[PDB]
Amino acid sequence: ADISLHHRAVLGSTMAYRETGRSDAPHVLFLHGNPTSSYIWRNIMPLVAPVGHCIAPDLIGYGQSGKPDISYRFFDQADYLDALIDELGIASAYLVAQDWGTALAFHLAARRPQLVRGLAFMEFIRPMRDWSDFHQHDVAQDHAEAARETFRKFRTPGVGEAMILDNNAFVERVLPGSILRTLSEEEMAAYRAPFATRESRMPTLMLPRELPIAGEPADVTQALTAAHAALAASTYPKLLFVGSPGALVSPAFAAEFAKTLKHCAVIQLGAGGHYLQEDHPEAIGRSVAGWIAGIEAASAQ
């Protein structure tokens, strides 16, 4: 019962979001990536409810949000998310993010440096100099190579169309292949539901093509480069969750990354895939809610 669904009309379309917690608590934005929706935060938001006003948007073209006729590039995603945030009047918020949600969060904090009260993040996107940086790890390689090959295909003209628009591979193969626990039939149903038609899957094809790999595309590479430099300069508290062996972010890399930042703690979750929320909702929700309470306590008087 506790989580409600809402919609706001913005940029000539609608954005959906899930909402829980007291109206008067600090704002907490939960930002999903590809090809998920605010549904992926369903077991995490109730744990954070006692300390934050939890808002979990569905990105444009994802979940219950509209499907306008737009390019669905990273910058489109940023623009729709901004519009919703502004419509709701959110001027100050914690961010909790994963996948393309972290790219959105980093870019948001860069453009709006007074907004972020703290960032909780995991499995984050950064500029990758070469394909060896996509899913980089030291554990005795076969998985990492096969994810590289999937995304190489997603990024190939015609091939990517057939895999994603025709066969919905990002939702049907990549998503469950990246979570350890067995998803229920209703959980798969909820993930595939926005994506029933071929055309509706375009956003899920657009995002692996926006990944900043070998400088391509340059616009996203450059924006995420600016965003990472702002992240490194920022002073707000940060919580970085990491799984083993890590998809985009290994435990070793998390540790080294965290030293490049101010006030970042690393939380080792143990075994996981790319989408950590489905294997660790309780460890994530519990950590985040205590972290917010801490920051709010220490910040006030």
Three-state SS annotation for 170-208: HHHHHHHHCCCCCCCHHHHHHHHHHHCCCHHHHHHHHCC
Out of 15, 51, 93, 179, which residue is the one contacting a copy of itself (CB under 8 A)? 51
Query: From Cl ion, a copy of itself, none, which one binds at residue 237 (CB under 5 to 8 Å depending on kind)?
Result: a copy of itself
Q: Is 294 in the site for a copy of itself (CB under 8 A)?
A: yes
| Stretch touching a copy of itself by CB under 8 A, among 6-14, 152-160, 170-178, 283-291 | 283-291
Q: How far is the CB of 299 from Cl ion (least distance, A)?
A: 28
DSSP one-letter code for 216? B
Quick check: 257 binds a copy of itself (CB under 8 A)?
no
The continuous run of DSSP H or E covering 242 comes out as: strand 238-245
268 is an interface residue for a copy of itself by CB under 8 A: yes
Q: Which does 34 bind (CB under 5 to 8 A by kind): a copy of itself, Cl ion, none?
A: Cl ion
Edge-first strand order for the sheet with 93-99 is 4-10, 13-20, 53-57, 27-31, 93-99, 116-124, 238-245, 264-272
First to last CA, the chain: 35
Confirm if 65 and 54 have CB atoms less than 8 A apart.
Answer: no
Q: Which is nearer to a copy of itself, 59 or 119 (CB)?
A: 119
Q: Which of 124, 123, 122, 116 is nearest to 295 (CA)?
A: 116
Binding pattern to Cl ion, positions 20-59, x when CB under 5 A? ------------xxx-x---x-------------------
Check residue 252 for interaction with a copy of itself (CB under 8 A). Answer: no
Does residue number 282 form part of the binding site for a copy of itself (CB under 8 A)? yes
DSSP 37-58: -GGGGTTTHHHHTTTSEEEEEP
Under the binding rule (CB under 5 A), the answer on residue 208 touching Cl ion is yes
Stretch that binds a copy of itself, among 58-66, 144-152, 189-197, 237-245 (CB under 8 A): 237-245
The interface partner of residue 289, options being a copy of itself, Cl ion, none and the CB cut-off 5 to 8 Å by kind, is a copy of itself
User: Interface with a copy of itself includes 238 (CB under 8 A)?
Assistant: yes
Question: Strands 27-31, 53-57: parallel, antiparallel or unpaired by DSSP?
Answer: parallel
Catalytic residue, candidates 76, 274, 278, 280: 274
Which of Cl ion, a copy of itself, none does residue 208 bind (CB under 5 to 8 Å by kind)? Cl ion
Does position 168 bind Cl ion by CB under 5 A? no
**Is 99 part of the annotated catalytic residue set?**
yes
* Nearest residue (CB) to a copy of itself, 140 versus 298: 298
**Least distance in angstroms from the C-beta of 194 to Cl ion:** 13
**287 contact choice in Cl ion, a copy of itself, none (CB below 5 to 8 Å, kind-dependent):** a copy of itself
Assess 90 for contact with a copy of itself (CB under 8 A): no
Provide the Cα torsion 84, 88, 92, 97; round to 10°: -40
What's the CA gap between 99 and 79, in Å, rounded? 18
What phi, psi does 22 have (nearest 5°)?
Answer: -70, 130
**Which tokens is 95 given?**
């961010």
Find the catalytic residue in 76, 123, 278, 279.
123
Non-local CB neighbours of 257 within 8 Å, separated by 6+ positions: 240, 249, 264
Contact 53, 28 (CB under 8 A): yes
| Residues binding Cl ion (CB under 5 A) | 32-34, 36, 40, 98-99, 207-208
